[PDB]
Structure formats: C-alpha cells, structure tokens
Design a protein around this nucleic acid. Structure first.
Lengths: 83, 95, 97, 109, 95, 109, 95, 109, 83, 97
DNA sequence: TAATCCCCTTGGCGGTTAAAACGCGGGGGACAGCGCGTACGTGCGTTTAAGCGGTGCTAGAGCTGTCTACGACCAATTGAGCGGCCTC
DNA sequence: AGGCCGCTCAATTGGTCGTAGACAGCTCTAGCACCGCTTAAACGCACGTACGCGCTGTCCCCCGCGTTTTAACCGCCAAGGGGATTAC
C-alpha cells in the first residue's frame, strides 16, 4: 500500500502538455526533473497546510476546502471548488 | 435527511437574465461566481475592519466601505461603484 | 515520402491546441497516487476527496503555467526559446522562492 | 396589525440580499456594530461587479456561438479586462485555461 | 401675481449632480436641456402614436416605446437604453 | 385613513418625473390609452440619455478648466459623439459654435 | 501630561536583559521591535480568526494558536515555539 | 480579604504582558471568547521569537564591536536567518540598510 | 503656489547610488528616466491610498501612520513608524 | 600623472560602501516637494508630517533596491553586466505588476 | 463527546486503446571568439539650492463636553430562496 | 439547465435600549513661511575604457514521427470509514 516513485507518475508528456498550455515551444532535457522537484515542493507546502488544517479539524479525509484555504495562504487563490 | 447549504445561485441567475435574457449558464461557472463573491466580500470586509481599527471606529459604515472600494477596487470600476452606491443609499434613505 | 513537418510546426500546433483546450493535462490516477504518496509522509493513512485531488491538479497545473509564463518571458529576455532550469530558478527567486 | 413584509433588498431594488450580506458581515467578526449604509453600499458594489462579469461572459459566449456560460468564457472575460486583471492577478480559475497568447518570436519568419 | 411655467430644471440638476457632484450649470445650457427633452419626447411619442396606428393598437405600452428606441436610437446606446428600461420595469413591477 | 404615497419616479428610483411624462403623453394626442410601462420606459431612456450627455459635458468642462457647463461644451459633446450626431444631425444649438475643424488643404505645407 | 500610549518597551527590555545583560538599545530599533511584535501579533491573530471561522469555532484556543504557529512559523522555529508555549501553558496551568 | 494580585506573565514565568495580549484579542475582533491558554501561548511564542532575535542582535552588535542595538544589526541578523527571512520577506526595516551581497559574476578575476 | 517638476529632484546620482546599494555595476543612461517613471507609479499608488486614508480620517495633515497602513496593504510593510 | 581608477572599481567601492552604509541616498527636500506636488494632484493644500515624508522615503528606496536586485538577477540571466530598462520591465511583470 | 449511518471514499477486476515509451532522422538552438561601434563610468571643477540653523505663527492635531443619531437585538411572521427531480 | 414543486429559515419590523462618534470648540504646537550662511550637490564636459551583441560557425539536443505496450480509463463490484448530524 506504500507508494515510492509516483513523482514519475506525472509523466514527461504531461510536462510537455503543460508547457504547451504555458506556451513553451522548445523544452530542454534538464527541465522535467526540475519541474518535478519544484511542483513537489509546492505540493508539499500546500498539503502541509492542508494536513495541518485536517488534524486541527480532527478529520482523516482531506477536503477541497482545506486545499482552498492552503492555496489562499500561499497567495494562489483558486475559484471553482466550493469556495 | 439533509442540511441546507447556502449559495448565491438565484441572485446571479436573476441579474444574468436581467442583462442577458437569452443567455444560459453552467454550474461550475456558478461555482467560480460563488468563489468570486465570497472572495471579494472577504477582501472588502477585511479592509473595512482595518479602517474601523485605524480610525478607532467601532462601527463600519458606508464611508468605510467606500474607502475600501477606493483602496482595493482600481480606477474606473471604483468610480462607477461609487456612483451606483450613492444612488443606492440615496434611494434607500428615500425608502 | 512520408510527410514530415519542420521542427517547431507540431510544437506550435500543440501551443494553439492546448491554449484552446481547457481540460486537465495530467493523468488522474498517478496524480492521486502521488498526492497520497507525499501526504503519507506527513500523516499516515490519509484519505482524499477525489474533488480535492482534481483541485490540487488544476491549481498545480495553473501554478506551473504561470511559472512557465515567467520562464519564457525570461527566455525571450534571454534571447532563447529552449528554456533551461536556470530560467525557472530565476523566475522563482525574483518571485521570491 | 403588522407592517407588510417588503425586504430591504427590494428597498434597494437590488437582487443581492441586504439581510444575508449584513448577517455575514456581522458574523464575520469585523466589528460588532455596522453602519446601515455599509451593506447596501457593499451589495450595490457586488451586484454591479457581477453585472460587468455577466456582460463580458455574455459577449464571450455569443462570440463562441454558445448560449451558455462556460468557465472558458470566464477566462476570456476576466483576463481581457485590465481592471479585472488588477483585481484578479493572483486568482486561479478552474478549467479556464489561459488567454490565447503567443509571443511574436514563436511565429515563423 | 404670476402664473407657473413648468420646466425640466431640477431633474437634470439631480442627474448632473449624480454624474458630476462638483459641476455647475449655465442657464442657457439648461434651456438646451429643456428643449432637448421636449424634442426627443415629441419624436418618440409621435413614433409610438404611429406604431399604435399601424398595429391598430389604441394603447401604447412599453413594447411600442421599445420599438421606437430600436428605430430612432442608433445601436449601442439603444442597447443600453433597453437595458435600463428592462431593469426599470422589473424593479417597478417589484415595487 | 390613507396609505402614504411615493412618487412613481421614486418607485422606479429614477429622477425624471414619471407622472409629468405620463400626463404629457396622455395630453399630447398620441393615444387615448397608454400602457403602464411606456412612460417609465421612456423616462428611463431620457434620463439615461441626459445622464450620458451631462457626463460628456462635465468631462469637457473639466478639460477646459471650467467648473460649469457652457453651450460650447454642449456643442463639443454632441458633435464629437457619432451616435449622438446621428440623433442630432439637423438640430441647431444656441451659442454653441462649431467643432475646431480645418481641412487638410487649408493648413500650410 | 499626555495620553498614555501602550508600547512594548519594558518587556523587550526585560527579555533583552535575559539574553544580553550587558548591552544597550537604540530607540529606533526599539520602535522597530514594537512594529515587529504588533505585526506578528496581527498575523497570528488574523490567522487564528481564519481557522476559527473554518472550524466554525466561536472561541480561539491555544490549539488554534498552535495551528497558526505551525502554519506561519518555519520548521524548527515552529517546533521550539510549540515547546516554549507548551512549557509556558503547563506552568500557567500549574499556576 | 483578597490574596496578593499576582501577574499572569510571572504565572507563566514570562515577561510579555498576558493581560495586554488577551485584552487586545478581545478588542481585535477575532473571536468574542478567547481560550485561556491562547494568549499565554501567543505571548510565549512572541517572547521566544523576540528573545532569539535580541540574542542575534546582541551577537551582531558584539561582532561589529558595538554595545547598543542598532537597526543595521537587526537587518544583518534577521535577513541572515533564512526561516526568519521567509517569515519576514516582504517587511521593510527603517534605516536597516541592505545585506552585503555582491554577485560572484560582479567580482573580478 | 503649484509645483510642476520635482520628479527631477530624485536626481540621477541618487539613482546611481541606489543602484550601487542595489548592486548594479553599470547603469545605462536609459535607466534613470524609466526608473523615475516606475517609482512615480509606485508613489502614486501609495499616496492615492494614503490620501484616501486621510480624508477617511477627516484630516488635512498627512501622518506617517496611514503611510504605514497603505504600505502594509500593498505588501511592502515597513518597520519603524508604527504607533 | 593624476590618479584614475579603472571602470567598475569606484562602482564596486560605492556598492560596498552603501551596502555597508544605511543612510538615505536621495536629498530629502526635493523628495518632499515631489510628495507635495503629487499630493496636490490628488488633493490640494495638503500638509505632511516630516516623519511621513521620511517614512515614504525609506519605503521608496527599499522598493527601488528590491527592483534593482531583481534587475541584476535578470541582467546576469541576460548574461550582462550593464542593465537596460527591459530588465526592469521584465521584473515588474514577474512580480505581477 | 457518544452513536451511527450512509454515502462517499477505497480496493479489486476485465478489457481498451490512450498514453506512455522508445528509438531514429534532422533541423534548429545556443552560444562563444572575435570584432566593432559603442555607451557610460570616472575626474573634477562650479553652481546652486540643499542643508543647517534660526524666528514667527497659526492650521489644524489633538483633546474635551453634548447630544442625538444609530444601530444591535428579541418575538413573530412571512416570503423568498434553497433541496429535489426530471426532462428536453 | 432549468424550471417547477415542497420545505424552512431568514429577514425584517416595531420597538427599545444602550452607546458612538459627530459636532463644537479650545489650544498649543509643529508645519509652514521667511531669512541667512555653508558647502555638498551636481552636473557637465572630457576622456579612458569596457559593453552588448552580432557573424560565422559549431556542436549537439530535443522535435517530430513513427511503433509497441501497458496500464489508465471506464464500467462493474464489494467494504466499510468517517463525517456529519443530533442529543447530552
């Protein structure tokens, strides 16, 4: 049940797709692992806040409202998830 | 048995059909609208609380809200909002 | 001969095709597995609302898109189109990361 | 025996609730006491703001030949207005995508 | 001993002070306002009378005036004119 | 004894007299019977039109560093709006002057 | 005299003599630490209000304050703040 | 017949005014009731941060052979603690100066 | 009574010295006027809020504390002038 | 021969000295007159506490030095030692302005 | 905090390509050595208004008495506004 | 979606009761205005010298264009976790 290498679950073509949404034409080989690391750091910060919320809420299920508040505290406020 | 969850659906529906009678809507667009109305509401409310604190005011009035509008809401939208709000408090005092 | 577009043509077609797109660009199941993976390190046996998983998905996608916007602004600033991770680090550190 | 129930939102002639916005401001712990013109002024501001949002959404939908608002229309509505952009620079939209935006260096010749 | 002469003075004064609280008024500009109000009122009223004749309707409702706005007022302003007219009849029926 | 009356202009929340426009329609020989939405609709149209032209005159007055409107400002406001010019192509304005307009051949060099 | 204005002069000075008995302090730096303690107090207070809103709690407790600390304060600052506040609240609980 | 009025800061064994912080939170509009250990915990956190900052300030003053706390010392201390740095990234110190920061590319061969 | 040009009073060597404090080793002649423009924009953004505070305060003399409020609103909080 | 330094040396010495020093680098009185003339652009005949003038000052130079640090980051990312205004415009867009 | 329930999450399974993945031709990209017009740092004297310091004064900042607006709050009552559904 | 049907809560009103700050008004004090001596500022021209970037080239690096494959997706099935709800 333990998971080990799901940062590679965010695939290389998914990175290419996102950069196409970002409007990036040419992408170096060094890009993908750096993107994986920085998204890992960003997710770690957000869910650290969310887990703090959840244990402060005495809950076990991660809710999207906690995601919303965590993104608010990082100045990345998201519309469209019950906020 | 269920518990009611309040949302701003019918009002945005009303003003949409007021300004565009022929225009439809999707529900997740309404989720983005609910997020918008709560977000801007809390921005204005926090700024109004700040202004009440700064000038030692225990009461937040329309002057506080208008001040918060000139602060947060930029430029042309602020002047329009001032205009219809002045109309709105005027007709409200007449009502 | 088989048809072959010049390098960048399919890239630009992907540019237009994914700017007109609105859908999520990540496979749902491995992203959910990754958020469970990372969150298990901070707290054990964590359960995820799937809507929260897609919320994290879309927020992360748009955060990355804003990051690559800053990146390719730096790249056209750097007279390049092959973006490299120092561009991303520049965007982060000027942003304050 | 009693005055007729005629709401303050109808007194404003505005669809946004005077009562609900007033109770959310009072419950929101910003001050224990609130001036009377504050929620009516706020509701007028909110309904007006949502009015230009709905205008831009309507023209965006009419441009893409659909009668119904999609959040892609919301993306095109928000990001194409400079004062709305200044209002929502840091705000993220679900399933909105981005503006159609290519730099001139990416085009051929 | 004199007799009252009616004009559109205070209403245009109210509207100007709504759109510009600090802007003053010259009297012959106000004469141009009164004459403009009378002119446009007579144009739209005559058009409504003609439309009432052509549809054989002895009653001129808001639909006739809306048609008259669509005819005389060109485009963009006419669209906005329909917008306040719809909102006004809605709020008048609600009041 | 009697309910306390509000003007129908106040019921609309509009500044133009609904009653005066209604009586000038009924006594202007256009129809013997007039639908209820017609004078409030027309009055809202007129108030919006005067609001626009008064806004234009006010901005023109602030351009000329004058606090008060003058019919020169009215001439500048009418003649520099395309749809208002379409409204008032054949209308003469007292003491208004004309637009500053010199043809290209009239200018030197 | 004048009205007494509350400041954090003496408590910062006591803590300074706890950590550095030998040194002095400038008044400009003193105002800076007054701004610091007021600013961080405001950050933690607003964050605790946010979390009390999210949990629908009418009362902000040291649980909420600890949550806000774990949010704002980074890493070892957060955990040693937890340790210090825990030791303090045990001493105050034991009077 | 009341006993000695003791102080809650000394009850916590601490220096920061518990009564002031509790009164400010009662008057700050954050919750109408405040938990009993909340201002004690808050003051403990504030004193811990203040104590470590003043320790760093005194050490920095000793580093430049001065015996008095200077805002330059505050800049050189807080901006050189990375967790205090990203705790206080957008905060300006009056007359604090800047960190000595030369880029290695700016230094000569 | 009125003043027409004091944005010139933020002089070019002052900009040079700041860029030395900002770490700039070589400053184009094109730098000074646009730096004046962007500081001009920033000071307008600050002082518009500060004036809004001031007639919200019913005062005619501008105080430093409202400047602190406006800076803290714009995410550029300044220590050393509060209270 | 009178003494003369190579380019950048006095620039670097100034860099070191004002990184060491903490004082204001702009004359206070033209700054004050600029504050008043932009005040009358919003409200005429305003009066300013001197503390407000210097508070606006240290805020102004702090904002400026932050922008110039970002400018140097862009310029070394532009592989350069001389900054051009497009660096500042880039950094201003990166900060979200 | 106890109960609890139910519904919403979690794990398992069967195919199906969609998506990933791997590999190969190829044009483009990045960018350095050197060159070359260049663009600005640095010297340092001169000007002047900033800086310092020195006076007079009242505008309004700030503090004090009144007082009435002003608005929160409770029982009741209603009407709008949300849960539910189905359907075109 | 939306529009229609059933519920319910919330929103208001009348009054009441406490109180907040607006207003007047004094006062006194620092900002403003005025005045005077000094020299830092500053700035402007000359000149030394280093800057930015482009040509050509150069080396190599993903992009595009496929094939293969596999597990993601979708549809289906069984479990119970826990979240939320009511009462104490």
């Amino acid at each position: 049940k333990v998971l080990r290498d799901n940062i590679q679950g965010i695939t290389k073509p998914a990175i290419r797709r996102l950069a196409r949404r970002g409007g990036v034409k040419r992408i170096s080989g060094l890009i993908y692992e750096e993107t994986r690391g920085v998204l890992k750091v960003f997710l770690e910060n957000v869910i650290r806040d969310a887990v703090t919320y959840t244990e402060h809420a005495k809950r076990k299920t991660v809710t999207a409202m906690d995601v919303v508040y965590a993104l608010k505290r990082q100045g990345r406020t998201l519309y469209g998830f019950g906020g | 048995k269920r518990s009611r969850k309040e949302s701003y659906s019918v009002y945005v529906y009303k003003v949409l059909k007021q300004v565009h009678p022929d225009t439809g809507i999707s529900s997740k667009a309404m989720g983005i609208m609910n997020s918008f109305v709560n977000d801007i509401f809390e921005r204005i409310a926090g700024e109004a609380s700040r202004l009440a604190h700064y000038n030692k005011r225990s009461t937040i009035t329309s002057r506080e809200i208008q001040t918060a509008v000139r602060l947060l809401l930029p430029g042309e939208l602020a002047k329009h909002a001032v205009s219809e709000g002045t109309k709105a408090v005027t007709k409200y005092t007449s009502a | 001969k088989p048809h072959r577009y010049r390098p960048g043509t399919v890239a630009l077609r992907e540019i237009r095709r994914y700017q007109k797109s609105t859908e999520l660009l990540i496979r749902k199941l491995p992203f959910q597995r990754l958020v469970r993976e990372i969150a298990q390190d901070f707290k054990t046996d964590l359960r995820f609302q799937s809507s929260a998983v897609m919320a994290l998905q879309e927020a992360s996608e748009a955060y990355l898109v804003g990051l690559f916007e800053d990146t390719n602004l730096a790249a056209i600033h750097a007279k390049r189109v092959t973006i490299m991770p120092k561009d991303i680090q520049l965007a982060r550190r000027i942003r304050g990361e | 025996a009693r005055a007729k129930a005629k709401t303050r939102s109808s007194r404003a002639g505005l669809q946004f609730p005077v009562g609900r916005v007033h109770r959310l401001l009072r419950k929101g712990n910003y001050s224990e006491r609130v001036g009377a013109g504050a929620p009516v002024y706020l509701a007028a501001v909110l309904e007006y703001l949502t009015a230009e949002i709905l205008e831009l959404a309507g023209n965006a939908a009419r441009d893409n030949k659909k009668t119904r608002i999609i959040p892609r229309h919301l993306q095109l509505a928000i990001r194409n207005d400079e004062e709305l952009n200044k209002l929502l620079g840091r705000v993220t939209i679900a399933q909105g995508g981005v503006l159609p935006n290519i730099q001139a260096v990416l085009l051929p010749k």
